[PDB]
Symmetry: D6
Subunit: 169 residues, 12 copies
């Protein structure tokens, strides 16, 4: 089974729009979930050539299976935020791990970043396990940082550095 | 039977345009009923990214059945106006109740609002009954607030708070 | 047989363009008759959202049969000019009366106007009869107000008030 | 004492803005009285090259004393509406008569119009007297055509033709 | 002592910007108080020719003393929201009453509205007294409708109709 | 056999472009013959709403057969220039006479012009005969006014007045 | 005494605007006399780089004394219309003759035109005398071609050719 | 001694531009320090009406003394980032504490936020002391999050909630 | 066999783009050969209405066979540069001579030019022979005026005047 | 087997987008690899008419096989950077040599450049061999000039002059 | 006495506009002499960044004394047209020679051109003498190439090459 | 004596424009030296927010003394080109060394670059000495890379890395 990344194209936006939790990976584009398709396409258009982001479609055996991205890319501090979403049926099969490692390879071996970081719900044990196996380490807790489904939730920030990634491939 | 909300898309505007009493839920867009289709589409375009509104199509067993929305969203005072219209054939079957509860869940569990309010004709006993069962309470009367079919009519304002909604699910 | 009004849509402009005396009901848009189709469509586009006018297609048994409109809508003085044109084959069958009554109902019961007025050729006995049966009363004569087919012609202004219309339904 | 007309210039708009009843002669520009200065200047800008209007400042012994204008100029029917406003202190001294005759001379001897018409309050005996001495004849009554200071008022339409004006100088 | 209204001009915006509680009368323009001067001027520019609002400066003995306005003007339902702010030093001297009566006279005798309404804090006994003496009647309570200085507050809606105003001058 | 005029539509420009001597009737649009199709369409677009011209297609038994037009329409002096071109195969059959009379009827009975004039080559005896039978009279000679096919040519101006046309139908 | 031409500059438009009969030499710019200053400046701006016209100020002993121009410049037919206006006080002193000869020299020796023509009132004997002395010959009469001060007037067209001008200097 | 906040005005940008460490509080506007004045003014212009930020000048005895702001305002999660910079001479005198408390009061009592957070260098003991006295608590460490003066530095995130702030005034 | 010219249309640009030596006749549009199709179409669009050029397709028995044009048209000096390119298969058959004579006829009999000139490689004996038979005479040599295929080349300028062309047909 | 160059057309961008190492030859357009298709098309559009670049598709037996280009074209110093990419399957067959020689011929025999230069990885022995056989000579080493696949790499600059190329064909 | 060149600045255009024969050195900008100042400034603005021209003011002892320029700069063929105009009072004193040598030095030593050429009237013996002393050689005669002051005139083209200029300094 | 850098402001462009060899440090903006002031200001405007460049004025004892800059900033490869120009009178006094060290400190300690490089004429021994004392090492020779004052010249590329700079301060 093959897994590859490709750039998120304007023609892929219907796919993105139909993903269940797509707002969670476009938090810096919009705050109100359930945006219209033309709202999403207009934001995409507004961000062409934006050096602070690179977004990718994850392909598995040639089918769209999710999205991975590096956002908030800061060239002075040489860091970015990593985010991923995988279609539910492709979950639990090792795809998130393989897609995440491709995006890490892009950030550290192609873009030459020093630090990658991510935010995950503190109760998402499965996700935290996957990120730890990839070399991410818990950095801190953001207390009541998100209001989700009627209550404030705690998030964990995790990070990894280029020297660690390169030393372990 | 399934009921779900989805964002009001630009391609759904022919549906909206053919609904009988569509002007009643677009009172802040236009005042003269019987707007043209291109008038409606131009207003939609002008309101992309407007943080004061979120409008949804109500789907029932995968067919368009009405519209529900939160308008006049005020982030400081944490409130919004709820409005709904259901195609006549889908009336009396419990759809308005189910659609309204989804929109309430969006306002209180997703957008984190404190207060939702609505306006209803004082003579619409069926509507008032449905809103009371959902937890709305009568707030006040707006006397001769609308000129409808040749005479001034009285409206009632109804409201519900987040603490009540969350305490009762 | 059904008669209904619907908004004049941009896609209805070919119909309007082919009506024989269409210039007579678009006197405030253009003065030189025999405008091109793109001249008419550009004017329509320029008047989207114009609160001074509402134009409708008249449908009879689901076929386009004419146009009725309220123009020069003045919100302070609460008045408008009524104008109608019916395709020739639909004339003499009671359609103008039924379409006019729908437009009157729109002006007085929906838009809340105080006064509707119209202008008619003094020699158009058939039209004057129809307007009088609808409750319009002769207001005055405009002497040599139009140059039509080679000679100046006299017009009559007719009017009706909301109180009269509402008192007689 | 000299009386002359000159074109209404953009630099004369502060004068126009401070005239007490300026809205009454700009009824086709705006309906809500008490427009802002930049509202008035933007409308002026929007009407440069508008062939339907010509507006003039009335000068008396070289001082701005009022406004006279020909609006709703229709080239097919060869007619226009005459309107005048004179600063209160310049009233009762024969200025309105002299300014009106200059504007009539412009309409009939320069623009080659066939008919000039005006609207006056039915209770304004002084104005009606002045217009009759200039050759205007009462054409008809517009019943409850204006809401002014809390009640509907009746207006009279008056008219004069080119042949009469030219035959009497 | 004279009191008069005049239109709010673009050159009056520095005055408006320095008024302490100016956000309370521009709630439909912006939500975050402490807007910049160029934010306020850009909003003013965007609302030139907006038929839904008329804003005035209140002058007392020829000095700027506050603002009064009619907003949310709805021509179909013939209603508007009245709002006023008076500079603190001009308070308690009868200016608010005199300015309010001028704005009421504008709404009912000039714009021909049917209903004027306002919102006032339930604890503002002085304001409620002034509005009652002008003929406003309490319409209803809006419960926890505003978050002000750290707590939700209750507001009262008050209204008056044209027939009452005209019958009492 | 029927002959009618209709407005020159944007979709008729391929027809106009393929007419042999089309430049001769568009002398005020362009001087260099053999303009490109997009040059012609751009000029058409630039002249929408131009009150100085009205151009028509001549139809004969429902087929495009030529062009007739009134250009340089001057509303003060109440005059226009008449120009016609007929496809060669439709020449000599009375079509030019019938089309010209329709355009004359438009200028004198619809637009209310006082004077129509035209320019014709002095050697075009056939054309001059047709214009004289329609009531045009020779006005003057324009000496060496056009350079055509390698030599200067003389033109004749011809004119007719509204009183003559109306007196003879 | 010196006489020279210079280009009509944007800063000379106040001068042009105050000339009594300036509309007579700007007939192809506007038809309604008494245009506003900003109407005139906007037309000037719209005609920058227009190859069909060249307009000049006439200077006499270094003071602005009138305007001379070549309009309707046609490069194919190598002709233009000459027009002149001289401030009244500079009339009768030989200035028109000297200014006209400079403009003729520009048309025939600089622009390389073949023919210059002008239009003059048939009753303007003084003007016709001046043009004949410059070599212009009467070409024809335009009957009732202008409506001026209440009656139709006859104009004469006059012309001169390059060969004549060059042969006589 | 008085301390007050006022909105950051476009005319205050020269002041902002000359502050030594101004880039540290405009990290979301630009990354390369030492931006030009017109770069800063263009960014300000681009952010008028941006609901995600409110920036203020700190005044002390009527003189500009620093900047305080709330950025990254998220209305769903009801949080913002607090940032402050004080001119060096105004440091150590209690101004930062007083200015910070005004900005906290704006965020919690005016904007109705739930959470405020800030980032501070881990070695800035003076700053951390001031924030702790205001009620901020250390939330977590961001490891090597900034490259400053040639080496990576560690930052601390600190936070406070509305309930705590309101309970302690 | 027929040969005719027609205007170069926007829809003919694919043909122009595929001609081998098309850059040689568009030297004033671009200098770097091998322009893209959209580069060529954008230049065409930029030159609509350019009075300095007229470009034609050469048709032979109704098939596109080359291009002929008059560029650098100067109306004062009454001259233009002639350029031609013929598809290779249509070479040696007399087409260039026939196409050139049509373009000469356009320049001298239609546009009324005084002088036509062209530039040809000094070593192109076949071309020089064709131009001499058409009446062109060698005017001068431009030494090392073009760098073509790795070396500087000499060009000859050739010219013909209108009097010669007209005297010989 | 034929090899030819043709201009890179807008319709060839899907081909360019799917080439594996396309970023390496568009380094002056964008830095972040994996640009979207609309990012690439927008950059292409922005560079139409850019005299600093000429890009070509390499065709082999009529199929797209790679890209060759001259970028950073400096007309004063008469130099450009040469870059090539060949689809992997077309590698090792002599295509790069043949395509490179066509591009060299374009730079030296068509554009008249003095110097061509290129950059190649120091470890790419195959490429360096091909460039040396074409006449390129090593100019210098750029130490750690590119970060590629996780480590800094050394590049070699190579150059050739027009005199050498022309002397050897 | 010093002579220097400096770039022609937008603020130098009043100087250029008042030079007697300025049109002769701006022949590719406009054809009709006596352009207005705003015509000249608009053309200047349109040519900012135009790589085909470089225009300079000639300074003598710090005073503007003329203009020198290189136009029609062709980077492929490495040539340009040299043109100069010197204020009349600065003529005959060696300034043209010194200014021309500076412009030659710019073309050959700075821009790296291969060939400079100029056009001069055949009867201007003084100019031809100056150009020959600078190394220009007569290239050819352009017969009746300019119409100047009423007759066609002959021009001479002169040229010089970089190798000659560099070999003689 | 103080030396400091500050951003190059739009108001500093007159200074830049008058520096003798300013083109040498703006080689990527324009190629033809002697650009006009408005050419330079337009380029500055076009590059606001350009992340590839940072340009500074060098101040010495509070007076403008030169320019230093980092251009071609590449965030992936973490490199930039350093360029400096010092007013001639400030040369030989140690200013270039002090200004260069400030710019190096900006590139390595603020922007976090890995490599800085520069180009210098091979014959500029003074410059090479200064750069070597700052830690730059010769990287390679660019042979005949610039045409300066009539001959091709050789340049040297020099470079320094962040680790070296940080290890030596
Ligand atoms: Cl961990
Ligand atoms: Cl919670
Ligand atoms: Cl209740
Ligand atoms: Cl009622
Ligand atoms: Cl009646
Ligand atoms: Cl009549
Ligand atoms: Cl009467
Ligand atoms: Cl009450
Ligand atoms: Cl006759
Ligand atoms: Cl002839
Ligand atoms: Cl005569
Ligand atoms: Cl008459
Ligand atoms: Cl703590
Ligand atoms: Cl020969
Ligand atoms: Cl050679
Ligand atoms: Cl080598
Ligand atoms: Cl490495
Ligand atoms: Cl010689
Ligand atoms: Cl070294
Ligand atoms: Cl050399």
């Amino acid at each position: 089974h093959s897994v590859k990344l490709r750039p998120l194209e304007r023609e892929d936006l219907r796919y993105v729009h139909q993903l269940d939790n797509n707002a969670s990976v476009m938090r810096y584009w919009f705050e109100e979930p359930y945006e219209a398709f033309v709202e999403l396409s207009d934001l995409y258009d507004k961000h062409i050539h934006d050096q602070s982001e690179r977004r990718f479609v994850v392909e598995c055996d040639g089918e769209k299976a999710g999205l991975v991205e590096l956002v908030e890319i800061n060239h002075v501090h040489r860091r970015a935020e990593f985010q991923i979403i995988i279609s539910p049926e492709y979950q639990g099969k090792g795809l998130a791990t393989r897609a995440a490692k491709l995006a890490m390879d892009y950030g550290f071996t192609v873009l030459n970043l020093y630090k990658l970081y991510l935010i995950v719900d503190k109760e998402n044990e499965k996700a935290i396990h996957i990120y730890r196996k990839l070399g991410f380490s818990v950095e801190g807790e953001l207390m009541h940082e998100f209001f989700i489904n009627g209550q404030y939730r705690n998030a964990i920030r995790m990070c990894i550095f280029q020297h660690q990634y390169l030393a372990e491939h």
